[PDB]
Design a protein around this motif. Sequence first.
Motif, short mmCIF file in Angstrom:
data_model
loop_
_atom_site.label_atom_id
_atom_site.label_comp_id
_atom_site.label_asym_id
_atom_site.label_seq_id
_atom_site.Cartn_x
_atom_site.Cartn_y
_atom_site.Cartn_z
N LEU A 1 0.59 -52.24 -43.96
CA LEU A 1 0.54 -52.34 -42.51
C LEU A 1 -0.84 -52.82 -42.13
O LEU A 1 -1.85 -52.41 -42.71
CB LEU A 1 0.84 -50.99 -41.84
CG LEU A 1 2.30 -50.67 -41.51
CD1 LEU A 1 3.27 -51.16 -42.58
CD2 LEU A 1 2.46 -49.17 -41.27
N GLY A 2 -0.87 -53.72 -41.17
CA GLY A 2 -2.12 -54.15 -40.62
C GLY A 2 -2.68 -53.01 -39.81
O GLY A 2 -2.50 -51.84 -40.14
N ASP A 3 -3.38 -53.37 -38.74
CA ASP A 3 -3.94 -52.42 -37.77
C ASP A 3 -2.91 -51.73 -36.90
O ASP A 3 -3.11 -50.59 -36.50
CB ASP A 3 -4.92 -53.12 -36.85
CG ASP A 3 -6.13 -53.60 -37.58
OD1 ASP A 3 -6.21 -53.38 -38.81
OD2 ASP A 3 -7.00 -54.20 -36.91
N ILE B 1 4.99 -46.74 -32.62
CA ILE B 1 3.78 -47.45 -33.00
C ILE B 1 3.09 -46.69 -34.11
O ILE B 1 2.85 -45.50 -34.01
CB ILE B 1 2.84 -47.61 -31.79
CG1 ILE B 1 3.52 -48.42 -30.68
CG2 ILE B 1 1.50 -48.20 -32.20
CD1 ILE B 1 2.80 -48.37 -29.35
N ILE B 2 2.76 -47.42 -35.18
CA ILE B 2 1.94 -46.90 -36.27
C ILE B 2 0.68 -47.72 -36.29
O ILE B 2 0.76 -48.94 -36.37
CB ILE B 2 2.69 -47.01 -37.63
CG1 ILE B 2 4.01 -46.24 -37.60
CG2 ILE B 2 1.79 -46.51 -38.75
CD1 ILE B 2 3.88 -44.76 -37.33
N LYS B 3 -0.48 -47.08 -36.21
CA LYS B 3 -1.73 -47.78 -36.02
C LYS B 3 -2.89 -47.16 -36.77
O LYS B 3 -2.82 -46.05 -37.25
CB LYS B 3 -2.03 -47.90 -34.53
CG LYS B 3 -2.29 -46.58 -33.81
CD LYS B 3 -2.36 -46.78 -32.30
CE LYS B 3 -2.86 -45.52 -31.58
NZ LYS B 3 -4.29 -45.22 -31.81
N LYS B 4 -3.97 -47.92 -36.87
CA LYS B 4 -5.22 -47.43 -37.41
C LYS B 4 -5.98 -46.71 -36.30
O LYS B 4 -5.99 -47.16 -35.16
CB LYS B 4 -6.05 -48.59 -37.95
CG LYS B 4 -5.48 -49.21 -39.23
CD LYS B 4 -5.87 -48.41 -40.47
CE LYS B 4 -6.03 -49.30 -41.72
NZ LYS B 4 -4.76 -49.77 -42.29
N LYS B 5 -6.56 -45.56 -36.64
CA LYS B 5 -7.43 -44.82 -35.74
C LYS B 5 -8.70 -45.63 -35.50
O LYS B 5 -8.99 -46.00 -34.36
CB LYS B 5 -7.79 -43.45 -36.35
CG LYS B 5 -8.47 -42.48 -35.38
CD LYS B 5 -8.76 -41.11 -36.01
CE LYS B 5 -7.49 -40.29 -36.23
N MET C 1 2.03 -47.62 -45.97
CA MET C 1 0.92 -47.73 -45.00
C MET C 1 -0.11 -48.80 -45.36
O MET C 1 -0.74 -49.38 -44.48
CB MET C 1 0.17 -46.40 -44.92
CG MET C 1 0.87 -45.29 -44.17
SD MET C 1 -0.02 -43.74 -44.39
CE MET C 1 1.36 -42.59 -44.32
#
Lengths: 65, 65
Positions: B24-26, B61-65, B21
């Motif tokens: 990973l970027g945003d 999709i894996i993303k920042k909250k 994680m």
Amino acid sequence: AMINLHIQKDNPKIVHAFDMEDLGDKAVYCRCWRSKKFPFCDGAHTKHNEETGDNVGPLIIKKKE
Amino acid sequence: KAMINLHIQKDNPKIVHAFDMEDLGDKAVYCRCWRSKKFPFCDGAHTKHNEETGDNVGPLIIKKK
Ligand code: FES
Ligand code: FES
């Protein structure tokens, strides 16, 4: 040939989006569309590959430590 | 009967990806259709697959909250 045979066919395009802060130490995502725990990998890919000669497998998201 | 992955790294008997994680970027957008030219990343190739076959697959999709 469709890739997905049975999962949420009332949804015209199945997308999952997760926040990485909501993830634990490790999440293992299905890329074969055969899991009974979809979007999560339950090992169903092994059967799929055996039956079809395919070479597909999951996506792992983890914390470095 | 039918394979899901037609062409991607067929010299690998089981294609698995693993990311931390922290690297990973945003936002990362991962392919679940095995048609992207940027595999393991999604490049929108799912839309053509779905149109061609009547399927309903899309990315993870894996993303920042
Ligand atoms: S169950 Fe689908 S990739 Fe493991
Ligand atoms: S290119 Fe495969 S899911 Fe988008």
